[PDB]
Amino acid sequence: ANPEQLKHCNGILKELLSKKHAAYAWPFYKPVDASALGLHDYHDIIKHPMDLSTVKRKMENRDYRDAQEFAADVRLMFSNCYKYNPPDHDVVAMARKLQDVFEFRYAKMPD
Ligand SMILES: [Cl-]
């Protein structure tokens, strides 16, 4: 069932990247460019950066062998946001909204 489940994961990924969610998904599209943002402590705090472009590359390259591996990366991305930013920052609100999209559809995985 890993291939079918991975198609569900790819569908989720496409949805997360889609225009429908862009108002809150956009901070997660590409790796955080810490230097560009003046976040000179980012890589001291976040040991394992993750973003949707990386998830997409990994999916396209058949790196993910199962849905759980995919989910762990998407959740890592959100965790990095929750770790680095104060909980009242807009980006955290954006993360929580995108994570809600993710978790509700991931829960519908065929099995
Ligand atoms: Cl997980």
Cα 38 to ligand 1 centre (Å): 30
Cα 73 to ligand 1 centre (Å): 8
Cα 26 to ligand 1 centre (Å): 22
Residue 8 CB contacts under 8 Å (≥ 6 apart), including other chains: 67, 108, 109, 110
Structure solved via: X-ray
Cα 68 to ligand 1 centre (Å): 6
Sole residue written with tokens 């790819």: 10
Q: C-alpha distances in angstroms, 7 versus 3, 11, 31, 67, 88?
A: 6, 6, 24, 9, 35
Crossing angle of helices 90-106 and 67-84, rounded to 10°: 160
As to burial, measured by CB atoms within 10 angstroms (0-12 exposed, 13-18 middle, 19+ buried), residue 102 is buried
Cα 21 to ligand 1 centre (Å): 22
Domain spanning 1-111: CATH 1.20.920.10: yes
Q: Can you give the residue ranges of every domain in the chain?
A: 1-111
Cα 37 to ligand 1 centre (Å): 28
Cα 30 to ligand 1 centre (Å): 21
Burial 30-61 (b: 16+ CB within 10 A, else e): eebebeeeebeebeeebeeebbbebbbebbee
